[PDB]
PDB file of all heavy atoms in Angstrom:
ATOM      1  N   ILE A 211      87.647  68.709  88.051  1.00 52.74           N
ATOM      2  CA  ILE A 211      88.356  69.818  88.613  1.00 52.74           C
ATOM      3  C   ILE A 211      87.521  71.079  88.520  1.00 52.74           C
ATOM      4  O   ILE A 211      87.440  71.884  89.458  1.00 52.74           O
ATOM      5  CB  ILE A 211      89.716  70.002  87.911  1.00 52.74           C
ATOM      6  CG1 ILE A 211      90.600  68.778  88.121  1.00 52.74           C
ATOM      7  CG2 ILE A 211      90.411  71.272  88.387  1.00 52.74           C
ATOM      8  CD1 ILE A 211      91.850  68.739  87.267  1.00 52.74           C
ATOM      9  N   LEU A 212      86.864  71.306  87.363  1.00 53.62           N
ATOM     10  CA  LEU A 212      86.014  72.475  87.203  1.00 53.62           C
ATOM     11  C   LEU A 212      84.834  72.427  88.179  1.00 53.62           C
ATOM     12  O   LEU A 212      84.473  73.456  88.776  1.00 53.62           O
ATOM     13  CB  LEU A 212      85.536  72.588  85.758  1.00 53.62           C
ATOM     14  CG  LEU A 212      85.237  74.008  85.274  1.00 53.62           C
ATOM     15  CD1 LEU A 212      86.525  74.774  85.072  1.00 53.62           C
ATOM     16  CD2 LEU A 212      84.394  73.958  83.999  1.00 53.62           C
ATOM     17  N   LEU A 213      84.240  71.261  88.364  1.00 54.88           N
ATOM     18  CA  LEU A 213      83.124  71.143  89.309  1.00 54.88           C
ATOM     19  C   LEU A 213      83.596  71.498  90.712  1.00 54.88           C
ATOM     20  O   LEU A 213      82.893  72.235  91.428  1.00 54.88           O
ATOM     21  CB  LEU A 213      82.550  69.737  89.259  1.00 54.88           C
ATOM     22  CG  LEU A 213      81.426  69.491  88.232  1.00 54.88           C
ATOM     23  CD1 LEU A 213      81.225  68.004  88.028  1.00 54.88           C
ATOM     24  CD2 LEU A 213      80.125  70.141  88.719  1.00 54.88           C
ATOM     25  N   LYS A 214      84.735  70.962  91.114  1.00 55.25           N
ATOM     26  CA  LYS A 214      85.220  71.258  92.462  1.00 55.25           C
ATOM     27  C   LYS A 214      85.535  72.746  92.637  1.00 55.25           C
ATOM     28  O   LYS A 214      85.239  73.343  93.668  1.00 55.25           O
ATOM     29  CB  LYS A 214      86.456  70.393  92.777  1.00 55.25           C
ATOM     30  CG  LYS A 214      86.147  69.106  93.549  1.00 55.25           C
ATOM     31  CD  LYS A 214      87.374  68.596  94.278  1.00 55.25           C
ATOM     32  CE  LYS A 214      88.394  68.022  93.305  1.00 55.25           C
ATOM     33  NZ  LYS A 214      89.640  67.616  94.005  1.00 55.25           N
ATOM     34  N   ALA A 215      86.181  73.342  91.632  1.00 53.92           N
ATOM     35  CA  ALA A 215      86.504  74.756  91.692  1.00 53.92           C
ATOM     36  C   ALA A 215      85.232  75.585  91.825  1.00 53.92           C
ATOM     37  O   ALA A 215      85.164  76.511  92.606  1.00 53.92           O
ATOM     38  CB  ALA A 215      87.316  75.163  90.473  1.00 53.92           C
ATOM     39  N   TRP A 216      84.215  75.276  91.024  1.00 50.60           N
ATOM     40  CA  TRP A 216      82.957  75.984  91.121  1.00 50.60           C
ATOM     41  C   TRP A 216      82.314  75.823  92.494  1.00 50.60           C
ATOM     42  O   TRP A 216      81.819  76.787  93.075  1.00 50.60           O
ATOM     43  CB  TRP A 216      82.004  75.536  90.022  1.00 50.60           C
ATOM     44  CG  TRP A 216      80.750  76.345  89.917  1.00 50.60           C
ATOM     45  CD1 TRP A 216      80.663  77.671  89.610  1.00 50.60           C
ATOM     46  CD2 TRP A 216      79.409  75.876  90.163  1.00 50.60           C
ATOM     47  NE1 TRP A 216      79.327  78.057  89.618  1.00 50.60           N
ATOM     48  CE2 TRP A 216      78.567  76.982  89.969  1.00 50.60           C
ATOM     49  CE3 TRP A 216      78.861  74.659  90.519  1.00 50.60           C
ATOM     50  CZ2 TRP A 216      77.177  76.890  90.123  1.00 50.60           C
ATOM     51  CZ3 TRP A 216      77.483  74.571  90.669  1.00 50.60           C
ATOM     52  CH2 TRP A 216      76.661  75.659  90.467  1.00 50.60           C
ATOM     53  N   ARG A 217      82.336  74.592  93.005  1.00 49.13           N
ATOM     54  CA  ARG A 217      81.719  74.352  94.304  1.00 49.13           C
ATOM     55  C   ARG A 217      82.399  75.139  95.405  1.00 49.13           C
ATOM     56  O   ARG A 217      81.724  75.720  96.269  1.00 49.13           O
ATOM     57  CB  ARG A 217      81.741  72.841  94.640  1.00 49.13           C
ATOM     58  CG  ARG A 217      80.408  72.322  95.169  1.00 49.13           C
ATOM     59  CD  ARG A 217      79.375  72.165  94.079  1.00 49.13           C
ATOM     60  NE  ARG A 217      79.700  71.076  93.177  1.00 49.13           N
ATOM     61  CZ  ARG A 217      79.503  69.787  93.440  1.00 49.13           C
ATOM     62  NH1 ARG A 217      78.987  69.396  94.594  1.00 49.13           N
ATOM     63  NH2 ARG A 217      79.846  68.894  92.535  1.00 49.13           N
ATOM     64  N   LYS A 218      83.720  75.179  95.393  1.00 50.14           N
ATOM     65  CA  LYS A 218      84.445  75.924  96.420  1.00 50.14           C
ATOM     66  C   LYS A 218      84.401  77.414  96.191  1.00 50.14           C
ATOM     67  O   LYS A 218      84.604  78.191  97.136  1.00 50.14           O
ATOM     68  CB  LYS A 218      85.887  75.440  96.480  1.00 50.14           C
ATOM     69  CG  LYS A 218      86.613  75.854  97.765  1.00 50.14           C
ATOM     70  CD  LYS A 218      88.117  75.662  97.650  1.00 50.14           C
ATOM     71  CE  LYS A 218      88.807  76.960  97.205  1.00 50.14           C
ATOM     72  NZ  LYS A 218      89.079  77.864  98.357  1.00 50.14           N
ATOM     73  N   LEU A 219      84.164  77.870  94.965  1.00 49.52           N
ATOM     74  CA  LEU A 219      84.141  79.286  94.679  1.00 49.52           C
ATOM     75  C   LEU A 219      82.884  79.968  95.199  1.00 49.52           C
ATOM     76  O   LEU A 219      82.957  81.086  95.696  1.00 49.52           O
ATOM     77  CB  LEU A 219      84.300  79.513  93.177  1.00 49.52           C
ATOM     78  CG  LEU A 219      84.309  80.962  92.693  1.00 49.52           C
ATOM     79  CD1 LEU A 219      85.613  81.643  93.101  1.00 49.52           C
ATOM     80  CD2 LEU A 219      84.117  81.036  91.184  1.00 49.52           C
ATOM     81  N   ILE A 220      81.761  79.291  95.087  1.00 49.54           N
ATOM     82  CA  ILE A 220      80.487  79.923  95.460  1.00 49.54           C
ATOM     83  C   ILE A 220      80.503  80.300  96.928  1.00 49.54           C
ATOM     84  O   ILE A 220      80.074  81.381  97.329  1.00 49.54           O
ATOM     85  CB  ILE A 220      79.305  78.988  95.123  1.00 49.54           C
ATOM     86  CG1 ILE A 220      79.226  78.754  93.604  1.00 49.54           C
ATOM     87  CG2 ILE A 220      77.990  79.575  95.611  1.00 49.54           C
ATOM     88  CD1 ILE A 220      78.665  79.908  92.819  1.00 49.54           C
ATOM     89  N   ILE A 221      80.988  79.398  97.795  1.00 48.41           N
ATOM     90  CA  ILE A 221      80.982  79.636  99.231  1.00 48.41           C
ATOM     91  C   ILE A 221      81.878  80.815  99.600  1.00 48.41           C
ATOM     92  O   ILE A 221      81.805  81.289 100.754  1.00 48.41           O
ATOM     93  CB  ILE A 221      81.443  78.386 100.002  1.00 48.41           C
ATOM     94  CG1 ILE A 221      82.821  77.932  99.532  1.00 48.41           C
ATOM     95  CG2 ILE A 221      80.436  77.266  99.835  1.00 48.41           C
ATOM     96  CD1 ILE A 221      83.457  76.873 100.408  1.00 48.41           C
ATOM     97  N   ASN A 222      82.730  81.284  98.688  1.00 48.31           N
ATOM     98  CA  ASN A 222      83.593  82.409  99.013  1.00 48.31           C
ATOM     99  C   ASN A 222      82.791  83.691  99.050  1.00 48.31           C
ATOM    100  O   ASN A 222      82.149  84.065  98.059  1.00 48.31           O
ATOM    101  CB  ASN A 222      84.682  82.527  97.953  1.00 48.31           C
ATOM    102  CG  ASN A 222      85.922  83.271  98.450  1.00 48.31           C
ATOM    103  OD1 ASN A 222      86.074  83.466  99.653  1.00 48.31           O
ATOM    104  ND2 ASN A 222      86.773  83.669  97.536  1.00 48.31           N
ATOM    105  N   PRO A 223      82.771  84.403 100.167  1.00 48.18           N
ATOM    106  CA  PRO A 223      81.999  85.665 100.211  1.00 48.18           C
ATOM    107  C   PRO A 223      82.490  86.697  99.208  1.00 48.18           C
ATOM    108  O   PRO A 223      81.677  87.491  98.711  1.00 48.18           O
ATOM    109  CB  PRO A 223      82.210  86.180 101.654  1.00 48.18           C
ATOM    110  CG  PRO A 223      82.602  84.966 102.434  1.00 48.18           C
ATOM    111  CD  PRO A 223      83.364  84.110 101.479  1.00 48.18           C
ATOM    112  N   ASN A 224      83.780  86.703  98.897  1.00 45.04           N
ATOM    113  CA  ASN A 224      84.336  87.699  97.984  1.00 45.04           C
ATOM    114  C   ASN A 224      83.730  87.588  96.593  1.00 45.04           C
ATOM    115  O   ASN A 224      83.499  88.590  95.951  1.00 45.04           O
ATOM    116  CB  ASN A 224      85.846  87.567  97.901  1.00 45.04           C
ATOM    117  CG  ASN A 224      86.518  88.750  97.256  1.00 45.04           C
ATOM    118  OD1 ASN A 224      86.134  89.157  96.159  1.00 45.04           O
ATOM    119  ND2 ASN A 224      87.511  89.343  97.937  1.00 45.04           N
ATOM    120  N   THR A 225      83.476  86.355  96.104  1.00 43.45           N
ATOM    121  CA  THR A 225      82.856  86.208  94.804  1.00 43.45           C
ATOM    122  C   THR A 225      81.475  86.822  94.776  1.00 43.45           C
ATOM    123  O   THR A 225      81.127  87.521  93.819  1.00 43.45           O
ATOM    124  CB  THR A 225      82.784  84.723  94.441  1.00 43.45           C
ATOM    125  OG1 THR A 225      84.096  84.210  94.226  1.00 43.45           O
ATOM    126  CG2 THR A 225      81.970  84.522  93.174  1.00 43.45           C
ATOM    127  N   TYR A 226      80.650  86.564  95.801  1.00 40.51           N
ATOM    128  CA  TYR A 226      79.332  87.179  95.868  1.00 40.51           C
ATOM    129  C   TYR A 226      79.458  88.698  95.931  1.00 40.51           C
ATOM    130  O   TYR A 226      78.700  89.420  95.282  1.00 40.51           O
ATOM    131  CB  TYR A 226      78.559  86.655  97.086  1.00 40.51           C
ATOM    132  CG  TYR A 226      77.908  85.316  96.893  1.00 40.51           C
ATOM    133  CD1 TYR A 226      77.647  84.512  97.988  1.00 40.51           C
ATOM    134  CD2 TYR A 226      77.564  84.836  95.629  1.00 40.51           C
ATOM    135  CE1 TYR A 226      77.029  83.278  97.841  1.00 40.51           C
ATOM    136  CE2 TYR A 226      76.953  83.609  95.467  1.00 40.51           C
ATOM    137  CZ  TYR A 226      76.693  82.832  96.584  1.00 40.51           C
ATOM    138  OH  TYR A 226      76.092  81.606  96.418  1.00 40.51           O
ATOM    139  N   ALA A 227      80.406  89.214  96.733  1.00 41.14           N
ATOM    140  CA  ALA A 227      80.570  90.648  96.835  1.00 41.14           C
ATOM    141  C   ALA A 227      80.897  91.249  95.491  1.00 41.14           C
ATOM    142  O   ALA A 227      80.283  92.250  95.063  1.00 41.14           O
ATOM    143  CB  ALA A 227      81.673  90.977  97.853  1.00 41.14           C
ATOM    144  N   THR A 228      81.820  90.646  94.756  1.00 41.07           N
ATOM    145  CA  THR A 228      82.216  91.178  93.449  1.00 41.07           C
ATOM    146  C   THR A 228      81.062  91.122  92.471  1.00 41.07           C
ATOM    147  O   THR A 228      80.800  92.080  91.741  1.00 41.07           O
ATOM    148  CB  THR A 228      83.419  90.407  92.918  1.00 41.07           C
ATOM    149  OG1 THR A 228      84.566  90.646  93.742  1.00 41.07           O
ATOM    150  CG2 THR A 228      83.749  90.835  91.493  1.00 41.07           C
ATOM    151  N   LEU A 229      80.358  89.980  92.425  1.00 40.79           N
ATOM    152  CA  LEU A 229      79.270  89.821  91.470  1.00 40.79           C
ATOM    153  C   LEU A 229      78.150  90.831  91.741  1.00 40.79           C
ATOM    154  O   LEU A 229      77.646  91.485  90.832  1.00 40.79           O
ATOM    155  CB  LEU A 229      78.738  88.396  91.514  1.00 40.79           C
ATOM    156  CG  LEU A 229      79.351  87.427  90.527  1.00 40.79           C
ATOM    157  CD1 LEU A 229      79.062  85.988  90.926  1.00 40.79           C
ATOM    158  CD2 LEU A 229      78.837  87.702  89.120  1.00 40.79           C
ATOM    159  N   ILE A 230      77.774  90.998  93.017  1.00 37.31           N
ATOM    160  CA  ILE A 230      76.727  91.939  93.349  1.00 37.31           C
ATOM    161  C   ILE A 230      77.196  93.373  93.090  1.00 37.31           C
ATOM    162  O   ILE A 230      76.417  94.190  92.603  1.00 37.31           O
ATOM    163  CB  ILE A 230      76.285  91.741  94.796  1.00 37.31           C
ATOM    164  CG1 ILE A 230      75.453  90.469  94.930  1.00 37.31           C
ATOM    165  CG2 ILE A 230      75.428  92.957  95.264  1.00 37.31           C
ATOM    166  CD1 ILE A 230      75.273  90.007  96.371  1.00 37.31           C
ATOM    167  N   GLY A 231      78.462  93.667  93.385  1.00 37.35           N
ATOM    168  CA  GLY A 231      78.967  94.995  93.098  1.00 37.35           C
ATOM    169  C   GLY A 231      78.915  95.350  91.625  1.00 37.35           C
ATOM    170  O   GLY A 231      78.504  96.451  91.250  1.00 37.35           O
ATOM    171  N   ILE A 232      79.296  94.410  90.767  1.00 39.38           N
ATOM    172  CA  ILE A 232      79.239  94.679  89.329  1.00 39.38           C
ATOM    173  C   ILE A 232      77.807  94.791  88.862  1.00 39.38           C
ATOM    174  O   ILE A 232      77.433  95.690  88.087  1.00 39.38           O
ATOM    175  CB  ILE A 232      80.010  93.603  88.543  1.00 39.38           C
ATOM    176  CG1 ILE A 232      81.523  93.754  88.800  1.00 39.38           C
ATOM    177  CG2 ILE A 232      79.709  93.722  87.061  1.00 39.38           C
ATOM    178  CD1 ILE A 232      82.325  92.549  88.404  1.00 39.38           C
ATOM    179  N   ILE A 233      76.950  93.866  89.311  1.00 42.56           N
ATOM    180  CA  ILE A 233      75.553  93.866  88.868  1.00 42.56           C
ATOM    181  C   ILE A 233      74.855  95.112  89.334  1.00 42.56           C
ATOM    182  O   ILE A 233      73.867  95.567  88.725  1.00 42.56           O
ATOM    183  CB  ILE A 233      74.825  92.593  89.385  1.00 42.56           C
ATOM    184  CG1 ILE A 233      75.365  91.360  88.666  1.00 42.56           C
ATOM    185  CG2 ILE A 233      73.329  92.719  89.150  1.00 42.56           C
ATOM    186  CD1 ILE A 233      75.120  90.079  89.404  1.00 42.56           C
ATOM    187  N   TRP A 234      75.323  95.725  90.438  1.00 46.42           N
ATOM    188  CA  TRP A 234      74.718  96.965  90.893  1.00 46.42           C
ATOM    189  C   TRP A 234      75.313  98.190  90.218  1.00 46.42           C
ATOM    190  O   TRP A 234      74.600  99.161  89.978  1.00 46.42           O
ATOM    191  CB  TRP A 234      74.878  97.114  92.402  1.00 46.42           C
ATOM    192  CG  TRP A 234      74.454  98.464  92.824  1.00 46.42           C
ATOM    193  CD1 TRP A 234      75.271  99.495  93.200  1.00 46.42           C
ATOM    194  CD2 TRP A 234      73.105  98.978  92.849  1.00 46.42           C
ATOM    195  NE1 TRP A 234      74.501 100.621  93.481  1.00 46.42           N
ATOM    196  CE2 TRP A 234      73.172 100.319  93.279  1.00 46.42           C
ATOM    197  CE3 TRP A 234      71.850  98.395  92.582  1.00 46.42           C
ATOM    198  CZ2 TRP A 234      72.035 101.103  93.436  1.00 46.42           C
ATOM    199  CZ3 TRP A 234      70.737  99.200  92.745  1.00 46.42           C
ATOM    200  CH2 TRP A 234      70.825 100.527  93.175  1.00 46.42           C
ATOM    201  N   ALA A 235      76.628  98.187  89.960  1.00 44.64           N
ATOM    202  CA  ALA A 235      77.228  99.325  89.268  1.00 44.64           C
ATOM    203  C   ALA A 235      76.632  99.451  87.863  1.00 44.64           C
ATOM    204  O   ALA A 235      76.403 100.571  87.397  1.00 44.64           O
ATOM    205  CB  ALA A 235      78.745  99.150  89.185  1.00 44.64           C
ATOM    206  N   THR A 236      76.409  98.329  87.207  1.00 46.20           N
ATOM    207  CA  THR A 236      75.740  98.351  85.873  1.00 46.20           C
ATOM    208  C   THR A 236      74.396  99.098  85.962  1.00 46.20           C
ATOM    209  O   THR A 236      74.149  99.997  85.165  1.00 46.20           O
ATOM    210  CB  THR A 236      75.559  96.952  85.353  1.00 46.20           C
ATOM    211  OG1 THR A 236      76.777  96.207  85.499  1.00 46.20           O
ATOM    212  CG2 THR A 236      75.158  96.956  83.889  1.00 46.20           C
ATOM    213  N   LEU A 237      73.564  98.709  86.920  1.00 46.38           N
ATOM    214  CA  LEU A 237      72.285  99.390  87.065  1.00 46.38           C
ATOM    215  C   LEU A 237      72.461 100.839  87.445  1.00 46.38           C
ATOM    216  O   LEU A 237      71.769 101.713  86.900  1.00 46.38           O
ATOM    217  CB  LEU A 237      71.448  98.667  88.147  1.00 46.38           C
ATOM    218  CG  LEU A 237      71.176  97.183  87.880  1.00 46.38           C
ATOM    219  CD1 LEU A 237      70.698  96.506  89.147  1.00 46.38           C
ATOM    220  CD2 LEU A 237      70.132  97.037  86.767  1.00 46.38           C
ATOM    221  N   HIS A 238      73.396 101.144  88.347  1.00 46.13           N
ATOM    222  CA  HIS A 238      73.566 102.520  88.817  1.00 46.13           C
ATOM    223  C   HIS A 238      73.953 103.442  87.670  1.00 46.13           C
ATOM    224  O   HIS A 238      73.470 104.581  87.585  1.00 46.13           O
ATOM    225  CB  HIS A 238      74.616 102.548  89.924  1.00 46.13           C
ATOM    226  CG  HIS A 238      74.959 103.920  90.410  1.00 46.13           C
ATOM    227  ND1 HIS A 238      75.669 104.811  89.665  1.00 46.13           N
ATOM    228  CD2 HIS A 238      74.668 104.544  91.580  1.00 46.13           C
ATOM    229  CE1 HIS A 238      75.825 105.943  90.339  1.00 46.13           C
ATOM    230  NE2 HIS A 238      75.224 105.790  91.512  1.00 46.13           N
ATOM    231  N   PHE A 239      74.848 102.976  86.779  1.00 43.92           N
ATOM    232  CA  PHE A 239      75.347 103.812  85.710  1.00 43.92           C
ATOM    233  C   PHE A 239      74.600 103.618  84.385  1.00 43.92           C
ATOM    234  O   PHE A 239      74.958 104.235  83.394  1.00 43.92           O
ATOM    235  CB  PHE A 239      76.837 103.552  85.501  1.00 43.92           C
ATOM    236  CG  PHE A 239      77.698 104.190  86.549  1.00 43.92           C
ATOM    237  CD1 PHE A 239      78.439 103.407  87.413  1.00 43.92           C
ATOM    238  CD2 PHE A 239      77.750 105.554  86.702  1.00 43.92           C
ATOM    239  CE1 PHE A 239      79.231 103.988  88.390  1.00 43.92           C
ATOM    240  CE2 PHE A 239      78.541 106.138  87.656  1.00 43.92           C
ATOM    241  CZ  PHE A 239      79.270 105.365  88.508  1.00 43.92           C
TER     242      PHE A 239
END
């Protein structure tokens, strides 16, 4: 179940958007 959830989560654009947003806010601040 965890493998399937991870596989389907990566393809979600929102996850990438959130991860990049946080990784960039950290650098910015």
Side-chain angles (χ1 to χ4, degrees):
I211 297 169
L212 208 72
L213 271 163
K214 264 202 289 175
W216 187 64
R217 225 75 70 78
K218 197 193 94 84
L219 181 70
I220 297 284
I221 58 169
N222 203 15
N224 195 307
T225 292
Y226 279 156
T228 294
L229 267 163
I230 288 165
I232 290 164
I233 291 158
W234 171 255
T236 312
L237 301 164
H238 176 288
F239 285 115

